Amino acid sequence: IIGGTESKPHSRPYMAYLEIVTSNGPSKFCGGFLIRRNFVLTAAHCAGRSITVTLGAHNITEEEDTWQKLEVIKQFRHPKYNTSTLHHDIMLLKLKEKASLTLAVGTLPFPSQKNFVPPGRMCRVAGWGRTGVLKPGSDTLQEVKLRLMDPQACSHFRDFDHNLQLCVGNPRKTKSAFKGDSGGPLLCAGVAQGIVSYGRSDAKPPAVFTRISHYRPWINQILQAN
Ligand SMILES: O=C(O)c1cc2ccccc2n1Cc1cccc2ccc(F)cc12
Numbered sequence: 001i002i003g004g005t006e007s008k009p010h011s012r013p014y015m016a017y018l019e020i021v022t023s024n025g026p027s028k029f030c031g032g033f034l035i036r037r038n039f040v041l042t043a044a045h046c047a048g049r050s051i052t053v054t055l056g057a058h059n060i061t062e063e064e065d066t067w068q069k070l071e072v073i074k075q076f077r078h079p080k081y082n083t084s085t086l087h088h089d090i091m092l093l094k095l096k097e098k099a100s101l102t103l104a105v106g107t108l109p110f111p112s113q114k115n116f117v118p119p120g121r122m123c124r125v126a127g128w129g130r131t132g133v134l135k136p137g138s139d140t141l142q143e144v145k146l147r148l149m150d151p152q153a154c155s156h157f158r159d160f161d162h163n164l165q166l167c168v169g170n171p172r173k174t175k176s177a178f179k180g181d182s183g184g185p186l187l188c189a190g191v192a193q194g195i196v197s198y199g200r201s202d203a204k205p206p207a208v209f210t211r212i213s214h215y216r217p218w219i220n221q222i223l224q225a226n
């Protein structure tokens with residue numbers, strides 16, 4: 001998160017910190033969010049050979065009783081995920097067990113409505129990602145208020161599409177999701193409308209988020225059938 005504030009500890013109890021293992025390099029990290037006691041939503045580009053989820057975290061460098069370190073048994077990438085265009089950049093993680101509900105750990109549900117969100121309004125995103133181009137990931141959960149933009153603001157991302165994705169962050173400001181924030185939810189008036197997907201290497205906003213609304217039928221399908 002660039003240009004944000006430190007979150008009040010445990011104030012976003014659905015937030016998930018993902019450590020992703022690959023066979024041939026060191027760990028990578030993403031965000032995500034708990035939508036059922038045994039399911040986490042994140043970005044498909046955060047897939048790996050294996051993933052460990054930490055719920056209940058604020059400062060990820062300091063173990064505490066709120067932590068739940070949970071095994072992932074299976075990763076379910078959206079079947080239309082494309083690694084070139086990054087369309088359908090969304091994935092469900094099934095946890096080996098159900099998480100414990102605590103003050104610091106709970107789910108974020110969807111409203112029954114599956115409405116399309118138009119541009120104009122302010123939304124919030126949180127994550128442990130980098131705080132600048134040459135800066136490590138934050139030890140503490142950070143968050144930032146960003147402007148939903150009209151889709152033309154993201155035209156320079158030549159594979160951006162308005163019906164699949166949200167365009168997030170006023171280009172006049174430095175405030176933005178960034179590397180390490182992948183998979184984190186964008187909340188607009190307290191409702192999850194998108195997922196951090198990608199942006200510019202130089203961190204100039206806007207960034208591109210996966211629009212959850214398109215995927216609700218998919219999300220329902222995996223949840224009902226697993
Ligand atoms: O480290 C990462 O999280 C990461 C790995 C990765 C692989 C394929 C696609 C995207 C990817 N991201 C997100 C990301 C990469 C570059 C610039 C970004 C700007 C803004 C933003 F929100 C997210 C960005």
Ligand SMILES: [Zn+2]
Pocket residue numbers: 009010058064066
């Ligand atoms: Zn604590």
